[PDB]
């Protein structure tokens, strides 16, 4: 059974996770626009930059986030951005969200200048995680949990972060025990993703360099969050 003091957390969090949202004028381009390596890339860039804005808003609304050292907020934001994106995109492919044009969106991803070494793992992650039949709450909690990771590089008060992350993990676990009494290893399976996600940061930094040397157009926001000269 979930406590009152917890059921209030999950609600505020679940609240933020549905508050903001990507504009339909943008998300419609997965459908309308032509399908070329340039147009695909541009659209993918547009998606990322807007999502970054949604992330900040969401993250800010996370309980206790703002009491944190401002230098630590940047480190957390710059550290979970990509991982959060993978989850949102996973959700999209997994829930086959309508405003996602999954098939078409996978088209544009498959052809945007992304190395094969990266596309494969990217989708394998998508297939395996989809097969977890996650509830929007699970995605939401793993996100907040991804964002509030203490063990992020360049973090000063890592203890302060743990204090913020612990409460969510438990809420997530509590739920696992409730809605998944049959299978006890669910929670640990969920946490596994956390590691899988990490793996992708190495890969992502690569692709940024690749695109970069190919005079690929990013945005002032993305360049900031991902440290690109």
């Amino acid at each position: 059974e979930l406590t009152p003091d917890q059921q209030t957390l999950l609600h505020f969090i679940m609240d933020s996770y549905n508050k903001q949202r990507m504009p339909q004028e943008i998300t419609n381009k997965i459908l309308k626009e032509e399908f070329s390596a340039e147009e695909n890339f541009l659209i993918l860039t547009e998606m990322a930059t807007n999502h970054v804005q949604v992330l900040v808003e969401f993250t800010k609304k996370l309980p206790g986030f703002q009491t944190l050292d401002h230098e630590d907020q940047i480190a957390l934001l710059k550290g979970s951005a990509v991982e959060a994106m993978f989850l949102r995109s996973a959700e999209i492919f997994n829930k086959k969200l309508p405003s996602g044009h999954s098939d078409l969106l996978e088209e544009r991803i498959r052809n945007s200048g992304i190395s094969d070494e990266y596309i494969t793992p990217m989708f394998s992650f998508y297939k395996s995680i989809g097969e977890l039949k996650m509830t929007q709450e699970e995605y939401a909690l793993l996100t907040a949990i991804v964002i509030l990771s203490p063990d992020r590089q360049y973090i000063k008060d890592r203890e302060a972060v743990e204090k913020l992350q612990e409460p969510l993990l438990d809420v997530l676990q509590k739920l696992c025990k409730i809605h998944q009494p049959e299978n006890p290893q669910h929670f640990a399976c969920l946490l596994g993703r956390l590691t899988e996600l990490r793996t992708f940061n190495h890969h992502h930094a690569e692709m940024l360099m690749s695109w970069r040397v190919n005079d690929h157009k990013f945005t002032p926001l993305l360049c900031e969050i991902w440290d690109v000269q």
């Binding site: 804005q53 900040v56 401002h70 907020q73 940047i74 934001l77 926001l221 900031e224 969050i225």
Partner: peptide
């Protein structure tokens, strides 16, 4: 450093 992130965080 980080003009945009800070800015968004203050809006």
């Amino acid at each position: 450093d980080h003009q945009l992130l800070r800015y968004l965080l203050d809006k």
